[model samples]
Target chain A: TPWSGYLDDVSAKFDTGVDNLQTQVTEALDKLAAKPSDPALLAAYQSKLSEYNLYRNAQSNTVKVFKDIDAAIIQNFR
Target chain B: TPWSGYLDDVSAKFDTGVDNLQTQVTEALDKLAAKPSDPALLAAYQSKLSEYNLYRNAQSNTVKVFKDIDAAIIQNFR
Candidate 1:
């Protein structure tokens, strides 16, 4: 029996999150260009970038997470 | 009555596109920062990130378009 808990939609969610982050970050940078010295603007830009990085790290770790959860899901179903 | 055209699940598309963009940008940055002074490398970094910024604007506008289309979709179904 195969479990579908962790891997069921892990890839899809990660993919979605990454896309959203990129789009947001991109717009933030554009605005920041006009006001480079604005702390708020810079913070927003940094937020988007940080969000993107966090998601990326999560994705990399998901590989190992999947490996661990897959067995658990299978065991539960069996 | 509603027609499944404009709002025909726009989210999934936006999400996927952003995800791919982030992954590409991250990898590009890693390579770019490895040699910041390298004009050619920095150019690529500027280019990739520039693309992300463009899409973000489109996304913000998409909200308005979604509203407009939502009305039309209902009318079309009638």
Candidate 2:
């Protein structure tokens, strides 16, 4: 039983974080939109967007990694 | 209230742009770690993770779209 390790908490935390992020991101964007005249604002938005893209690509890869791990764990259990 | 569109004051704006993506990701992983790596568990994670990717890619695309819009808006508004 102990070897199995409870995963519910992990999933819950991840889900919560994902939800919060969605909110935070929308806020960050609205903020950027307000600074229309500021070149620095535009620069910041562009930079953040770029970083977001990078992280998102990583996140995409993480999904695949998690899937691989999941398969491995199942095979091990079997 | 108005077409379900208030979305707050949108003041949390950036001078230009933003991501906060890396922290968002780390938090996601830490939360994921709290759970077990079982098959069903893994399936749930994968499914949600894939959905997050979809949103992220869309956000990425949105940045591009926004950039174009910004340029146009500037030209039109100027």
Candidate 3:
């Protein structure tokens, strides 16, 4: 019972956070696209992209982990 | 340069851990599915799932936090 509620809250929180992150990333990209490429900006952009890639990969893996668990439960319960 | 190499290593490590977790969870479910529905088994399954869910939620947040930082950098740079 506790787990059910806790999981529901966690899922909602996680989903909102994930959505917000994507929105931020998208907004960032659009803003950056219009700016002229200064050397400093170029370096920063590249560095950020690399950093972002690290998070993206981790996020992806995290998503997959839950999906597998969900699938496992579904496969068994069905 | 250090960030690049460090990120690459972290990404690889995270990816491998994620993949392994999936494999483990999948194998666990398959094994559990074949077992008869005992009360203990049901409880254990639910508990494990619940525990795993907590980890999942944390992992998702960790991903989002990094993404936010990345997005902030991107937005400022460009």
Candidate 4:
């Protein structure tokens, strides 16, 4: 019942999305350091932070989802 | 290929780590903003930012490693 394809899908999307958002944060950061007080760079990093926050939340929710699905899979087969 | 149980573990760890770091960032920001222009506030925020930077880097690498693992799983089992 634990399908490899589905697991890979989850990892691919979840991790890649996180990495993608983090990328922008890093980009915003190098510039941020150049002008530590730069509001624009701060704003950009905050924007990207929002993205990571949601994805981080998604990761939490998906763990719950997997638990529910896996439980049923184990039960239904019996 | 998808092991639901294992997926749950990885996701739980990832979520926990992100949440912990985010919590520190939030706490640091509130006090830093409250006492604007304070040297200590700047120092603390700067310190937390470094930790966040390192963690994000690790996460980006996490995605790459997972991708490779997913690939190995596909090939290994075949």
Q: What do the candidate models score in CA lDDT, each in turn?
A: 0.60, 0.49, 0.52, 0.61
- TM-score per model over all chains: 0.37, 0.34, 0.37, 0.41
Q: Compared with the true structure, what per-residue lDDT tens digits does model 1 show for residues A1-78? A: 866565657855776544455566678889999899754465455545544554555565666567777778889986
Error of 1 at A11 (Å): 34
- For residues A1-78, could you state the per-residue lDDT of candidate 2 as single tens digits? 534333444434444545545455555566545434345655665666555444444444445456567878999986
Interface RMSD list for the candidates:
16.2, 17.1, 15.4, 13.6
Chain B TM-score of model 4, please? Answer: 0.65
Residue B69 of candidate 1: its Cα lDDT? 53
Error of 1 at A32 (Å): 19
Give the candidates in order of DockQ, highest first.
2, 4, 3, 1
Name the runs in model 2 displaced over 4 angstroms.
Answer: A1-25, A76-78, B1-78
Off by over 4 Å in 3: A1-78, B1-21
Alpha-carbon deviation at B46 in model 1, angstroms: 1.5
TM-score of model 4 (CA atoms): 0.41
Worst 10-residue lDDT window for candidate 1 chain A reads A42-51
lDDT (Cα, tens digit) per residue for candidate 2, span B1-78: 444212222212221233444354555566668876666556666655654454454445554554553454344322
Off by over 4 Å in 1: A1-78, B1-8, B17-19, B68-78
Q: Per-prediction DockQ scores? A: 0.02, 0.06, 0.03, 0.04
Supply the TM-score for candidate 2: 0.34
The most accurate candidate by TM-score is: 4
| lDDT per residue (tens digit) for residues A1-78 in model 3 | 345453355445545544344444455476578784532233334334555564555545555566677778889985
CA lDDT of B57 in candidate 3? 52
Give the poorly placed runs of model 4, Cα more than 4 Å off: A1-5, A15-19, B1-78
* Candidate 4 all-Cα RMSD: 14.0
